[PDB]
Coordinates of N, CA, C and O in Angstrom, one line a residue:
Chain M
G253 N 0.8 -1.2 0.0 CA 0.0 0.0 0.0 C 0.8 1.3 0.0 O 0.3 2.3 0.3
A254 N 2.1 1.2 -0.3 CA 3.0 2.4 -0.4 C 3.1 2.9 -1.8 O 3.3 2.0 -2.7
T255 N 3.2 4.2 -2.0 CA 3.4 4.7 -3.3 C 4.7 4.4 -3.8 O 5.7 4.3 -3.1
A256 N 4.8 4.2 -5.2 CA 6.0 3.8 -5.8 C 7.0 4.9 -5.8 O 6.7 6.1 -5.6
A257 N 8.3 4.5 -5.9 CA 9.4 5.5 -5.9 C 9.7 5.9 -7.4 O 10.2 5.2 -8.2
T258 N 9.3 7.2 -7.7 CA 9.4 7.8 -9.0 C 10.6 8.8 -8.9 O 10.6 9.7 -8.1
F259 N 11.6 8.6 -9.7 CA 12.8 9.4 -9.6 C 13.5 9.5 -11.0 O 13.0 8.9 -12.0
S260 N 14.5 10.3 -11.1 CA 15.3 10.5 -12.3 C 16.7 9.9 -12.1 O 17.4 10.1 -11.1
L261 N 17.1 9.0 -13.0 CA 18.4 8.4 -13.0 C 19.3 9.0 -14.0 O 18.9 9.1 -15.2
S262 N 20.5 9.3 -13.6 CA 21.5 10.0 -14.4 C 22.7 9.1 -14.8 O 23.2 8.4 -13.9
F263 N 23.0 9.0 -16.1 CA 24.1 8.2 -16.6 C 25.2 9.0 -17.2 O 26.1 8.4 -17.9
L264 N 25.1 10.3 -17.1 CA 26.1 11.2 -17.7 C 27.5 10.9 -17.2 O 27.7 10.3 -16.2
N265 N 28.5 11.4 -17.9 CA 29.9 11.2 -17.6 C 30.3 9.7 -17.6 O 31.0 9.3 -16.8
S266 N 29.7 9.0 -18.6 CA 30.0 7.6 -18.8 C 31.0 7.5 -20.0 O 31.1 8.4 -20.8
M267 N 31.7 6.4 -20.0 CA 32.8 6.1 -21.0 C 32.5 4.9 -21.8 O 32.1 3.9 -21.3
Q268 N 32.6 5.1 -23.2 CA 32.4 4.0 -24.1 C 33.8 3.5 -24.7 O 33.8 2.7 -25.6
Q269 N 34.9 4.0 -24.2 CA 36.2 3.7 -24.8 C 36.6 2.3 -24.5 O 35.9 1.5 -23.8
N270 N 37.7 1.9 -25.1 CA 38.2 0.5 -25.0 C 38.8 0.3 -23.6 O 40.0 0.4 -23.4
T271 N 38.0 -0.1 -22.6 CA 38.4 -0.4 -21.3 C 38.7 -1.8 -21.0 O 39.1 -2.2 -19.9
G272 N 38.4 -2.7 -22.0 CA 38.6 -4.1 -21.9 C 37.4 -4.8 -21.4 O 36.8 -5.7 -22.0
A273 N 36.9 -4.4 -20.2 CA 35.7 -5.0 -19.5 C 34.8 -3.9 -19.0 O 35.2 -2.7 -18.9
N274 N 33.6 -4.3 -18.7 CA 32.6 -3.4 -18.2 C 32.4 -3.6 -16.7 O 32.2 -4.7 -16.2
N275 N 32.6 -2.5 -15.9 CA 32.5 -2.6 -14.5 C 31.9 -1.3 -14.0 O 32.2 -0.2 -14.5
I276 N 31.1 -1.4 -12.9 CA 30.4 -0.2 -12.3 C 31.4 0.5 -11.4 O 32.1 -0.1 -10.6
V277 N 31.5 1.8 -11.6 CA 32.5 2.6 -10.8 C 31.8 3.4 -9.7 O 32.5 3.8 -8.7
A278 N 30.5 3.8 -9.9 CA 29.9 4.6 -8.9 C 28.4 4.4 -8.9 O 27.8 4.0 -9.9
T279 N 27.8 4.6 -7.7 CA 26.3 4.6 -7.6 C 25.9 5.3 -6.3 O 26.5 5.1 -5.3
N280 N 24.9 6.1 -6.4 CA 24.4 6.8 -5.2 C 23.0 7.3 -5.5 O 22.5 7.3 -6.6
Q281 N 22.3 7.6 -4.4 CA 20.9 8.1 -4.4 C 20.7 8.9 -3.1 O 21.6 9.0 -2.3
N282 N 19.5 9.5 -3.0 CA 19.2 10.5 -1.9 C 17.9 10.0 -1.2 O 17.0 10.8 -1.0
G283 N 17.8 8.8 -0.8 CA 16.7 8.3 0.0 C 17.2 7.4 1.1 O 18.2 6.7 0.9
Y284 N 16.5 7.5 2.2 CA 16.9 6.7 3.4 C 15.7 6.3 4.2 O 14.7 7.0 4.2
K285 N 15.8 5.2 4.9 CA 14.7 4.8 5.8 C 14.8 5.5 7.1 O 15.9 6.0 7.5
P286 N 13.8 5.6 7.9 CA 13.8 6.2 9.2 C 14.8 5.6 10.2 O 15.0 4.3 10.1
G287 N 15.5 6.4 11.0 CA 16.5 5.9 11.9 C 16.4 6.6 13.2 O 15.6 7.4 13.5
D288 N 17.4 6.2 14.1 CA 17.4 6.8 15.5 C 18.8 7.1 15.8 O 19.8 6.6 15.2
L289 N 19.0 8.1 16.8 CA 20.3 8.5 17.2 C 21.1 7.3 17.7 O 20.6 6.5 18.5
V290 N 22.4 7.3 17.3 CA 23.2 6.2 17.8 C 24.5 6.8 18.5 O 25.0 6.2 19.4
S291 N 24.8 8.0 18.1 CA 26.0 8.7 18.6 C 26.1 10.1 18.0 O 25.4 10.4 17.0
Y292 N 27.0 10.9 18.6 CA 27.2 12.3 18.1 C 28.5 12.8 18.7 O 29.0 12.2 19.6
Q293 N 29.0 13.9 18.1 CA 30.2 14.5 18.5 C 30.2 15.9 18.0 O 29.3 16.4 17.3
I294 N 31.3 16.6 18.2 CA 31.5 18.0 17.8 C 32.8 18.1 17.0 O 33.8 17.6 17.4
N295 N 32.7 18.7 15.8 CA 33.8 18.9 14.9 C 34.4 20.2 15.0 O 33.9 21.1 15.7
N296 N 35.6 20.4 14.4 CA 36.4 21.6 14.5 C 35.7 22.8 13.8 O 36.0 24.0 14.1
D297 N 34.7 22.5 13.0 CA 34.0 23.6 12.3 C 33.0 24.3 13.2 O 32.5 25.4 12.8
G298 N 32.8 23.8 14.4 CA 31.8 24.4 15.3 C 30.4 23.8 15.2 O 29.5 24.2 15.9
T299 N 30.2 22.9 14.2 CA 28.8 22.4 14.0 C 28.7 21.1 14.8 O 29.6 20.4 15.1
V300 N 27.4 20.8 15.2 CA 27.1 19.6 15.9 C 26.5 18.6 15.0 O 25.5 18.9 14.3
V301 N 27.0 17.4 15.0 CA 26.6 16.3 14.1 C 26.1 15.2 14.9 O 26.8 14.7 15.8
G302 N 24.9 14.7 14.5 CA 24.3 13.6 15.2 C 24.2 12.4 14.3 O 23.4 12.4 13.3
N303 N 24.9 11.3 14.6 CA 24.8 10.1 13.8 C 23.6 9.2 14.1 O 23.2 9.1 15.2
Chain S
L102 N 46.0 11.0 1.9 CA 44.9 11.4 1.1 C 43.7 11.6 1.9 O 43.3 10.7 2.7
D103 N 43.0 12.8 1.8 CA 41.9 13.1 2.6 C 40.6 12.5 1.9 O 40.7 11.7 1.0
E104 N 39.4 12.9 2.4 CA 38.2 12.3 1.9 C 38.0 12.8 0.4 O 37.4 12.1 -0.4
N105 N 38.4 14.0 0.1 CA 38.3 14.6 -1.2 C 39.5 14.1 -2.1 O 39.7 14.8 -3.2
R106 N 40.2 13.1 -1.8 CA 41.3 12.5 -2.5 C 42.5 13.5 -2.7 O 43.2 13.4 -3.7
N107 N 42.7 14.4 -1.7 CA 43.7 15.4 -1.7 C 44.7 15.1 -0.6 O 44.3 14.6 0.5
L108 N 46.0 15.4 -0.8 CA 47.0 15.2 0.1 C 47.0 16.2 1.2 O 47.1 17.4 0.9
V109 N 46.8 15.8 2.5 CA 46.7 16.7 3.6 C 47.6 16.1 4.8 O 47.7 14.8 4.8
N110 N 48.1 16.9 5.6 CA 48.9 16.5 6.8 C 47.9 15.8 7.8 O 46.7 15.7 7.6
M111 N 48.5 15.3 8.9 CA 47.7 14.7 9.9 C 46.8 15.7 10.7 O 46.0 15.2 11.4
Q112 N 47.0 17.0 10.5 CA 46.2 18.0 11.3 C 45.1 18.5 10.5 O 44.0 18.8 11.1
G113 N 45.2 18.7 9.2 CA 44.2 19.3 8.4 C 44.6 20.5 7.5 O 43.8 21.3 7.0
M114 N 45.9 20.6 7.3 CA 46.5 21.6 6.4 C 46.6 21.1 5.0 O 47.2 20.0 4.8
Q115 N 46.1 21.9 4.0 CA 46.1 21.4 2.7 C 47.4 21.6 2.0 O 47.9 22.7 1.9
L116 N 48.0 20.5 1.6 CA 49.3 20.5 0.9 C 49.2 21.2 -0.4 O 48.2 20.9 -1.2
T117 N 50.1 22.1 -0.8 CA 50.1 22.8 -2.0 C 51.3 22.6 -2.8 O 52.4 22.2 -2.3
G118 N 51.2 22.8 -4.1 CA 52.3 22.6 -5.0 C 52.0 23.2 -6.4 O 51.0 23.8 -6.6
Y119 N 53.0 23.0 -7.3 CA 52.8 23.5 -8.6 C 51.7 22.7 -9.4 O 51.8 21.5 -9.4
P120 N 50.7 23.4 -9.9 CA 49.7 22.6 -10.6 C 50.2 22.0 -11.9 O 51.1 22.5 -12.5
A121 N 49.6 20.9 -12.3 CA 49.9 20.2 -13.5 C 48.8 20.5 -14.6 O 47.6 20.1 -14.3
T122 N 49.1 21.1 -15.7 CA 48.2 21.4 -16.7 C 48.8 21.0 -18.1 O 49.9 20.5 -18.1
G123 N 48.0 21.1 -19.1 CA 48.4 20.7 -20.5 C 47.7 19.3 -20.8 O 47.2 18.6 -20.0
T124 N 47.9 19.0 -22.1 CA 47.3 17.8 -22.7 C 48.4 17.1 -23.5 O 48.6 17.5 -24.7
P125 N 49.1 16.1 -22.9 CA 49.0 15.6 -21.6 C 49.5 16.6 -20.5 O 50.3 17.4 -20.8
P126 N 49.0 16.4 -19.3 CA 49.5 17.3 -18.2 C 51.0 17.2 -18.0 O 51.6 16.2 -18.1
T127 N 51.6 18.4 -17.8 CA 53.0 18.5 -17.6 C 53.2 19.5 -16.4 O 52.3 19.8 -15.6
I128 N 54.5 19.9 -16.1 CA 54.8 20.7 -15.0 C 55.1 22.1 -15.4 O 55.9 22.3 -16.4
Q129 N 54.5 23.0 -14.8 CA 54.7 24.5 -15.0 C 55.5 25.1 -13.8 O 55.0 24.9 -12.7
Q130 N 56.6 25.8 -14.1 CA 57.4 26.4 -13.1 C 57.0 27.9 -12.8 O 57.6 28.5 -12.0
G131 N 56.0 28.4 -13.5 CA 55.5 29.7 -13.3 C 54.1 29.8 -12.9 O 53.6 30.9 -12.6
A132 N 53.4 28.7 -12.8 CA 52.0 28.7 -12.4 C 51.8 28.9 -10.9 O 52.7 28.5 -10.2
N133 N 50.8 29.6 -10.6 CA 50.5 29.9 -9.1 C 50.3 28.5 -8.4 O 49.5 27.7 -8.9
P134 N 50.8 28.4 -7.2 CA 50.6 27.1 -6.5 C 49.2 26.9 -6.2 O 48.4 27.8 -5.9
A135 N 48.8 25.6 -6.2 CA 47.4 25.2 -6.0 C 47.4 23.9 -5.1 O 48.4 23.2 -5.0
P136 N 46.3 23.6 -4.4 CA 46.2 22.3 -3.7 C 46.4 21.1 -4.6 O 46.0 21.2 -5.8
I137 N 47.0 20.1 -4.1 CA 47.2 18.9 -4.9 C 46.2 17.8 -4.5 O 46.0 17.5 -3.4
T138 N 45.5 17.4 -5.6 CA 44.5 16.3 -5.4 C 44.8 15.2 -6.4 O 45.4 15.4 -7.4
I139 N 44.4 14.0 -6.0 CA 44.7 12.8 -6.8 C 43.4 12.1 -7.1 O 43.0 11.1 -6.4
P140 N 42.7 12.5 -8.1 CA 41.4 11.8 -8.5 C 41.6 10.4 -9.0 O 42.7 10.1 -9.5
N141 N 40.6 9.6 -8.8 CA 40.6 8.2 -9.3 C 39.9 8.1 -10.6 O 39.7 6.9 -11.1
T142 N 39.5 9.2 -11.2 CA 38.7 9.1 -12.5 C 39.5 8.6 -13.6 O 40.7 8.7 -13.7
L143 N 38.8 7.9 -14.5 CA 39.4 7.3 -15.7 C 39.8 8.3 -16.7 O 38.9 9.2 -17.0
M144 N 41.0 8.3 -17.2 CA 41.4 9.2 -18.2 C 41.0 8.8 -19.6 O 41.0 7.6 -19.9
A145 N 40.6 9.8 -20.4 CA 40.2 9.5 -21.8 C 41.3 9.0 -22.7 O 42.5 9.4 -22.5
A146 N 41.0 8.2 -23.6 CA 42.0 7.7 -24.6 C 42.4 8.8 -25.5 O 41.7 9.8 -25.8
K147 N 43.6 8.7 -26.1 CA 44.2 9.7 -27.0 C 44.4 9.1 -28.3 O 44.8 7.9 -28.5
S148 N 44.0 9.8 -29.4 CA 44.2 9.4 -30.7 C 45.7 9.3 -31.1 O 46.4 10.2 -30.7
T149 N 46.1 8.3 -31.8 CA 47.5 8.2 -32.2 C 47.8 9.3 -33.2 O 47.0 9.5 -34.2
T150 N 48.9 9.9 -33.0 CA 49.3 11.1 -33.9 C 50.6 10.8 -34.6 O 50.6 11.0 -35.8
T151 N 51.6 10.3 -34.0 CA 52.9 10.1 -34.6 C 53.4 8.7 -34.2 O 53.3 8.3 -33.1
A152 N 54.0 8.0 -35.2 CA 54.6 6.7 -35.0 C 55.9 6.7 -35.7 O 56.1 7.3 -36.7

């Protein structure tokens, strides 16, 4: 009963040259499941980061 | 090598040096110093010119 994930996938900056074999070099997206605080600390920038 | 694939000391100071430019990249002794980074990106193939 959950709505489907509709997104845009980008394949730009890909290479078709003679690399010998085909292998994936990178993959990323901007979605995450809900989580809870596990730890945190303070960085030299002055910002507070919660993991 | 830092997270951004650049050479940094153990404290967080950005190592600087003579930038490498040209096709293929070479060494310039008059160019303004710039931070040194070492990307892992695949370099494009070059057409054969002289044999």
